[PDB]
Amino acid sequence: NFCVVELLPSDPEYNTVASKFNQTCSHFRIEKIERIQNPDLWNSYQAKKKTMDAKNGQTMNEKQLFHGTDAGSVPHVNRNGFNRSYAGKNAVAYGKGTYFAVNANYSANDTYSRPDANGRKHVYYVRVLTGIYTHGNHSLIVPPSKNPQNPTDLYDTVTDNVHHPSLFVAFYDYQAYPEYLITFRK
Numbered sequence: 001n002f003c004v005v006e007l008l009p010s011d012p013e014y015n016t017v018a019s020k021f022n023q024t025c026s027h028f029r030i031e032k033i034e035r036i037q038n039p040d041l042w043n044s045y046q047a048k049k050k051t052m053d054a055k056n057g058q059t060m061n062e063k064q065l066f067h068g069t070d071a072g073s074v075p076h077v078n079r080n081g082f083n084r085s086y087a088g089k090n091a092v093a094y095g096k097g098t099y100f101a102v103n104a105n106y107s108a109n110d111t112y113s114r115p116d117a118n119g120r121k122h123v124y125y126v127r128v129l130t131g132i133y134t135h136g137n138h139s140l141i142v143p144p145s146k147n148p149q150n151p152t153d154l155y156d157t158v159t160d161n162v163h164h165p166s167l168f169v170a171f172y173d174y175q176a177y178p179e180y181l182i183t184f185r186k
């Protein structure tokens with residue numbers, strides 16, 4: 001269960017999100033930005049953030065990233081977040097989880113934010129608990145262990161490039177909160 005508030009171009013949140021989107025997608029046309037309010041998903045996410053904060057020390061565990069999807073997946077995502085059934089439909093090259101882009105222009109590709117019948121594209125601005133990350137590979141359904149001494153001490157997410165990331169993979173729904181849906185067109 002969830003609700004969705006459309007933000008007005010005059011609200012600080014709209015402008016914050018638009019600004020970040022527009023850093024690589026200015027030449028596209030924003031039609032609306034919606035804030036997604038899903039209590040259970042948000043409660044689960046904040047619980048995961050508390051334990052991750054008390055584990056990774058000084059690490060800034062949270063990044064805001066982009067996720068392009070088809071119109072048909074918006075209801076499933078607003079309702080159950082980036083759950084396993086959704087990840088099944090994501091790429092594999094860096095593991096079997098949900099894929100998130102540092103730059104909007106990556107997520108805006110038609111391959112990901114597929115234009116619907118009316119030419120409308122959908123990209124989420126997502127809160128993701130990236131935590132401590134390592135290089136991903138095709139065989140992962142969860143991040144590797146850091147050490148063999150402790151095989152239950154896992155990296156929090158994986159990436160294409162640890163020092164210069166372009167994307168991150170999350171393997172659990174409670175690691176990614178879809179705060180904002182950007183609806184836009186070419």
Ligand SMILES: O=c1[nH]c(CS[C@H]2CC[C@H](O)CC2)nc2cc(NC3CCCC3)cc(F)c12
Nearest residue numbers: 066067068069070089091093099101106107112
């Ligand atoms: O924004 C993205 N969204 C997505 C979801 S795809 C979408 C297609 C329609 C289905 O119903 C729902 C899933 N995947 C990504 C992957 C990326 N990279 C991988 C690709 C090739 C190896 C790495 C970079 C991305 F930005 C993104």
